[PDB]
Design a protein around this ligand. Structure first.
Ligand code: HEM
Length: 407
């Protein structure tokens, strides 16, 4: 393929400036599964010499489905850390469900599903609606400011807090910890210590579990820590690792969908007009497809496997570029058209279907629909003041800041 020498699709230096859309498109055309070699010292924590770049949606689906072969546990699913991260700090990720394989994953996911039933998520609708409206009214009253801080940031965190029944008086500290827990190599956050924030949140969560045991109530936390028919339940530490996971799975992901959804609307005025008029809930999936907040997650081959004619060898990493897959010309009609009515919309923003498919997908969609209804209600004529500031990360597609005029 026509790419520069030394080009690495996980290079945070790229994402600090842009999404490598042309480069992904080149791979889908010329080399849809392509060895992305990595130079000595430049492995983002992985010292294996590179990985297979996976760029087509059907290949992402196949990997995701064949979790018996393609492991989350072996190397974790984050494909890029600081180049000099200790192996121990990669392996500690195995304490959360995202980086577990069956049978351990299977047990935990069955327990955790208690928190993500249609009924459980539905119970959050009304409070998240009220919150969304307030957030939007407060931003409008400010006149202008940072859209990320004023509009995108709070609702995802309030969704997590509502799900867990976190007391109001505890939400400030919970949000502070949660906003420091996703690693990046952005100079703006170089002083932050994810390890400390994570240890604090796990302490808080474990205390919550021990209290809920003594004082059972009708809520999600009680359901998680009380034995089901099979005696299955989260132990306190497992509850702690569940909360830590949510702090990093359900926070910057939804936040970035909201910011980039609004960026797409700013760029596509006809779609924004249509949105304001009919408020189509299909908008949430097109926003997730367009935003692809997780650019890539990886897996490791536990055995040799032939994927679309390419021999993947035992021990090798495959990196699923959801950002490429979501613009796959073979799956979508006019992928580079932003169409809030797209239906069906079989995007892989929430992963390929399979064992690890995003458990929060419907919570995320509801969050997105509620905040954009609020933005429509309170700031229908908002316009950007300056360009978004992107996050320096090799796997998260983030917007740090974006100045907008709500009037
Ligand atoms: C637009 C926002 C979101 C995006 C783009 C997103 C994306 C993803 C992706 C790509 C995965 C991995 C899927 C796979 O490997 O097949 C995932 C897993 C997960 N997500 Fe989401 N997510 C979002 C919102 C949320 C929310 C709001 C929550 C809960 C509050 C959540 C909780 C989880 C959890 C717990 C997992 C791990 C599931 C497992 O390993 O079994 N996510 N998400």
């Amino acid at each position: 393929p026509n790419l520069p020498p030394g080009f690495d699709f996980t290079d945070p230096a790229i994402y600090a400036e842009r999404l490598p859309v042309a480069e992904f498109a080149e791979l889908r055309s010329a080399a849809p599964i392509w060895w992305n070699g990595q130079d000595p010292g430049k492995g983002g924590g992985f010292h294996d010499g590179g990985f297979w770049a996976i760029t087509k949606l059907n290949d992402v689906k196949e990997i995701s489905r064949h979790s018996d072969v393609f492991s989350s546990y072996e190397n974790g699913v984050i494909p890029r850390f600081k180049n000099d991260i200790a192996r121990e700090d990669i392996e500690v990720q195995r304490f959360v469900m995202l980086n577990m394989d069956a049978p351990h994953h299977t047990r935990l996911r069955k327990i955790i599903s208690r928190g993500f039933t249609p009924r459980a998520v539905g119970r959050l609708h009304d409070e998240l609606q009220e919150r969304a409206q307030k957030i939007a009214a407060e931003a409008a009253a400010a006149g202008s400011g940072d859209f990320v801080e004023q509009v995108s940031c709070e609702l995802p965190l309030q969704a997590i807090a509502g799900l867990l029944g976190v007391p109001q008086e505890d939400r400030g500290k919970l949000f502070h910890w949660s906003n420091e827990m996703t690693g990046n190599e952005d100079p703006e956050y170089a002083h932050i210590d994810p390890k400390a924030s994570s240890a604090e949140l796990i302490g808080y969560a474990m205390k919550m579990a021990e209290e809920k045991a003594k004082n059972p109530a009708d809520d999600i936390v009680t359901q998680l820590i009380q034995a089901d028919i099979d005696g299955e339940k989260l132990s306190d530490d497992e509850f702690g690792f569940f909360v830590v996971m949510l702090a990093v799975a359900g926070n910057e992901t939804t936040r970035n969908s909201i910011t980039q959804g609004m960026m797409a609307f700013a760029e596509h005025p006809d779609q924004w007009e249509l949105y304001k008029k009919v408020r189509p809930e299909t908008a949430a999936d097109e926003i997730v497809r367009w935003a692809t907040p997780v650019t890539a997650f990886q897996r490791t081959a536990l055995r040799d496997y032939e994927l679309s004619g390419v021999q993947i060898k035992k021990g090798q990493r495959v990196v699923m570029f959801y950002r490429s897959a979501n613009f796959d010309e073979e799956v979508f009609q006019d992928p580079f058209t932003f169409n809030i009515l797209r239906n069906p919309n079989p995007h892989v923003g929430f992963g390929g279907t399979g064992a690890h498919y995003c458990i929060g997908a419907n919570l995320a969609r509801m969050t997105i629909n509620l905040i954009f209804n609020a933005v429509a209600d309170h700031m229908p004529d908002l316009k950007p003041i300056s360009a978004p500031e992107r996050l320096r990360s090799g796997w998260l597609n983030g917007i740090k800041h974006w100045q907008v005029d709500y009037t």
